[PDB]
């Protein structure tokens, strides 16, 4: 015997006349308030997923349409609310303002601007919750997204319409690698979006001004849901960011999106689910949680031109759009045999695993081979990079496992002195300083000079000065080819002779 949110004066109103539905179906009254969850009575007209407008300027999301009351979550400071407040249902499913005019703004998860620069020049509104394009509307990802980093572009290539998990322990360059990719994307026509989920505001402000310095901010939208803010804002924030990326996708453009910690989105959703008394599963997360990440990430897709025509009512005839997602995941103590990391590994295409041991030892970025993969693979790469970089990640997989097993000495020295000096020389070459993005031409000539032996004997170290000289010598005099090979990506024996002639001329003339 327990009550079910029927109380004295509501029963009295029903006593006055049973069919109180003779009153408006458009509005109701708050009945309880607890930890950001709200129970509402009335709202016969409410529909699930609807934005409910509260006094002040606040919204709640109708999650439950129960027998007599609506259960909702408040997208903001909830402590100001009280019983009996009149509440009105806007007849709108949860929608965020969207458009190209958002580029360069910093906005709340509701699309309310958070910088001081006034209102938004949005195009329209679009639903936060949507079902991704169907199996027949996709197209194969076959175009590159070049990053700044020699290690990832060689080993773990990313393509337009791919989904790359960036997974690692705390303080291993997960943000550094993602924002440095955003910085490299400017002057390449692909837009970018950065969704800060559960981040502390000092860090968000630092990276926003660091994107503004490099001129990247005019290209990118920033969505911010800081660690102080209600859990409904935190878990809804990535879906708003995806709703902004999806506009560019459906207009036949290219967009890139970084979800700055799905592992905090999961915790915020676990909080909301345990406050609603739902039975938890493994690690106390809800059963839903895989659906939480899947419906979010499958939206990042590449669509064929027939879908863009059918969507834009013909206006954009014959272009293919894409959204490229790079979610970040933080794993405790470096294990990937965990519930949420393995969930997102099961959803995303590739996997960049950043390792803490390598990061401490000075190998930065700490891309661990063997665990990291790209399930799209070579099809993403420019054919020069494809042909030059071949199988090296698997070579390092075995080079790492063998240097780990054969610890006592370099016994059976058949070619292990070459193999292990080459593997050291390459690992030393992949090391790179942040905010120094290398064009595909520079990566290609460096990986060419490394991979087919031309420097496996000279373990001189001093490597950084040799590269910084090499790229200057080719920029100033030796290579008009830099502008050509950065455009075509072409691989030809004619160009191989051109580049090998430069390589021999520098390697003969200059002692590193």
């Amino acid at each position: 015997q327990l009550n079910s949110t029927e109380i004295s004066e509501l029963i009295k109103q029903r006593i006055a006349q049973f069919n109180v539905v003779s009153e408006a179906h458009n509005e109701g009254t708050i009945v309880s308030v607890s930890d950001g969850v709200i129970r509402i009575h009335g709202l016969a007209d409410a529909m699930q997923g609807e934005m409910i407008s509260l006094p002040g300027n606040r919204y709640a999301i109708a999650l439950n349409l129960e027998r007599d009351s609506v259960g909702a979550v408040v997208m903001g400071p909830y402590a100001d609310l009280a019983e009996g407040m009149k509440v009105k249902a806007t007849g709108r499913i949860l929608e965020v303002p969207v458009g190209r005019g958002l580029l360069g703004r910093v906005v709340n998860t509701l699309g309310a601007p958070i910088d001081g620069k006034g209102p938004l020049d949005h195009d329209g509104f679009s639903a936060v919750e949507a079902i991704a394009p169907g199996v027949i509307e996709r197209q194969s990802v076959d175009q590159p997204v070049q990053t700044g980093y020699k290690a990832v572009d060689s080993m773990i290539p990313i393509g337009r319409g791919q989904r790359e998990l960036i997974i690692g322990d705390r303080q291993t360059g997960k943000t550094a690698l993602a924002i440095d990719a955003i910085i490299n994307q400017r002057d390449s026509g692909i837009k970018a979006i950065y969704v800060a989920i559960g981040q502390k505001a000092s860090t968000i402000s630092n990276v926003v001004r660091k994107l503004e310095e490099h001129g990247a901010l005019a290209n990118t939208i920033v969505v911010v849901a800081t660690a102080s803010e209600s859990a409904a804002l935190q878990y809804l924030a990535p879906y708003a960011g995806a709703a902004m990326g999806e506009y560019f996708r459906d207009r036949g453009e290219d967009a890139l999106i970084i979800y700055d910690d799905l592992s905090k989105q999961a915790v915020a959703y676990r909080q909301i689910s345990l406050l609603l008394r739902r039975p938890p599963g493994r690690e106390a997360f809800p059963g839903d949680v895989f659906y939480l990440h899947s419906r979010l990430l499958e939206r990042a897709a590449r669509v064929n031109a027939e879908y863009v025509e059918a969507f834009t009512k013909g206006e954009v005839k014959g272009k293919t759009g894409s959204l490229t997602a790079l979610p970040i995941i933080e794993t405790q103590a470096g294990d990937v045999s965990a519930f949420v990391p393995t969930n997102v590994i099961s959803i995303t295409d590739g996997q960049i695993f950043l390792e803490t041991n390598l990061f401490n030892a000075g190998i930065r970025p700490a891309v661990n081979p063997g665990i990291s993969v790209s399930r799209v693979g070579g099809a993403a790469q420019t054919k020069i990079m494809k042909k030059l970089s071949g199988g090296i990640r698997t070579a390092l997989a075995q080079y790492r496992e063998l240097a780990a097993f054969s610890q006592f000495a370099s016994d059976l020295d058949d070619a292990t002195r070459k193999q292990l000096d080459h593997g050291q020389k390459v690992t030393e070459l992949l090391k790179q300083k942040q905010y120094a993005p290398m064009s595909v031409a520079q990566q290609s000539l460096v990986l060419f000079a490394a991979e087919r032996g031309y420097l496996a004997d000279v373990e001189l170290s001093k490597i950084g000065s040799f590269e910084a000289a090499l790229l200057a010598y080719v920029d100033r005099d030796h290579a008009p080819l830099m502008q050509e090979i950065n455009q075509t990506g072409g691989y030809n024996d004619e160009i191989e002779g051109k580049l090998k002639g430069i390589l021999d001329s520098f390697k003969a003339t200059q002692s590193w």
Partner: protein, 460 residues
């Protein structure tokens, strides 16, 4: 016409009230006008007051309580037969490619009883796959069940694509592929591989990929299995590929709490083993036709003892267990030979030489496992001069189990290799008895038959 009304909406589940003289049965379909679209509900329970709990076969947003719903007096029914071959279908049997309607003459309810006991048939006819470890360790027969177990990113789908290539193209009968809660990208890449290989005319496709709400993922395996059952009853023999069966149970877990059922061992629905057995028992060969099936079986958090893997293991005939440790080595296919098994690995079925080779490979790989802890503490030097020989042979075996794949020809540049059963037992029997003791370990990594390892040794 419309005779019932919505009275609750909790996420994926909906409660509908009917007159007590017209309440639907416990698997009927219902229809609702959701905004402008048409939404189908499948009833799961009869509560007392002419109310009924249903699962929405579609997006639940936009549903008001008080909408009128219309009682279709028949279960969900899907097109079936020859008409459904070169085409992609929804969970509701609707066409999802942009082609016209399906030309079926007959439609079947997706909830059906398993074949009787006197109607089953069992076959010893060994089926050959190009894959050294799978047929050596876990050989499977025509009309048997194969299951691939693994965590995330270990190789389940690449191996299932190799099995499709190696059996399913040089096979006569029709084939059915059900994508249950996996990537739409991979479904599109598969559909375009089939259409550009002109084999699509034989492969019926059903998709309920991981973007769909729980009801589509829950039912889509049953609607794919119905099409396989129809091709079985015509007297044919059929291949059925299910791209992640685990998602069926997971969609049941997601729904289970909302249906008002007390949670079980690790969160799973109380009915986990019955929900799984009701699907698994009807995917079987009978005396009129045979279904050969390969299932991928994701294991959450790499925990092989999680209730869903543990209760799945009993249903299959050949279980191949992938492991992340071996994949981290880069040794694909990352089969664990100390956990993979088959019903068919008996000397009377396989023959004595195969059986002895497989048991010797297991025995020395187990002895190497037993040495690894002492090798980790003390180091290798302490081992006996016998122990070092079984370690060297076990490591050479672990390398020789690897093989390049025609479908992995885009992750590595190596050409794919097809290895016959004779050549693999000839090579493993050669390695075990020490006739290749002089080659280095790297001579065996990613090769075909042993005569390619002897060549690779020359080039280091």
């Amino acid at each position: 016409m419309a005779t019932g009304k919505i009275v609750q909406v909790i996420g994926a589940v909906v409660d509908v009230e009917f007159p007590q003289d017209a309440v639907p049965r416990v698997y009927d379909a219902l229809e609702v006008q959701n905004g402008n679209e048409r939404l189908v509900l499948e009833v799961q329970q009869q509560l007392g007051g002419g109310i009924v709990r249903t699962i929405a076969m579609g997006s639940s947003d936009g549903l008001r309580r008080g909408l009128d719903v219309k009682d279709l007096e028949h279960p969900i029914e899907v097109p079936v037969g020859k008409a459904t071959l070169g085409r992609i279908m929804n969970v509701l049997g609707e066409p999802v490619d942009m082609k016209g309607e399906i030309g079926e003459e007959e439609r079947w309810a997706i909830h059906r009883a398993a074949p009787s006991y006197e109607e089953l048939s069992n076959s010893q006819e060994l089926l050959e796959t190009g894959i050294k470890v799978i047929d050596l360790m876990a050989p499977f027969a025509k009309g048997g069940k194969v299951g691939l177990f693994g965590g995330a990113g270990v190789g389940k789908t690449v191996n299932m694509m190799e099995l499709i290539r190696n059996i399913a193209i040089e096979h006569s009968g029709y084939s059915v592929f059900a994508g249950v809660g996996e990537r739409t990208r991979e479904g599109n890449d598969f559909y375009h591989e089939m259409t550009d290989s002109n084999v699509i005319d034989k492969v019926s496709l059903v998709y309920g990929q991981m973007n769909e709400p729980p009801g589509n993922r829950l039912r889509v395996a049953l609607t794919g299995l119905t099409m396989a059952e129809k091709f079985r009853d015509e007297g044919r023999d059929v291949l059925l590929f299910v791209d992640n069966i685990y998602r069926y149970t997971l969609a049941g877990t997601e729904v289970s709490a909302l249906l008002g059922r007390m949670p079980s061992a690790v969160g799973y629905q109380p009915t986990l083993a019955e929900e799984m057995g009701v699907l698994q028992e009807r995917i079987t060969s009978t005396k009129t036709g045979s279904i050969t099936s390969v299932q991928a079986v994701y294991v959450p958090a790499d925990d092989l003892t999680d209730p869903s893997p543990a209760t799945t293991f009993a249903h299959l005939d050949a279980t191949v267990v992938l492991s992340r440790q071996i994949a981290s080595l880069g040794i694909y296919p990352a089969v664990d030979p100390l956990d993979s098994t088959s019903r068919q690995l008996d000397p009377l079925v396989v023959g004595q030489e195969h059986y002895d080779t497989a048991r010797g490979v297991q025995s020395i790989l187990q002895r190497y496992q037993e040495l690894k802890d002492i090798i980790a503490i003390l180091g290798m030097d302490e081992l006996s001069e016998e122990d070092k020989l079984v370690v060297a042979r076990a490591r050479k075996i672990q390398r020789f189990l690897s093989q390049p794949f025609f479908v992995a020809e885009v992750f590595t540049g190596s050409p794919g290799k097809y290895v016959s059963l004779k050549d693999t037992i000839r090579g493993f029997k050669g390695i075990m008895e020490g006739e290749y003791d002089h080659l280095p370990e790297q001579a065996f990594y990613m090769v075909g038959s042993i005569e390619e390892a002897v060549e690779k040794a020359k080039k280091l």
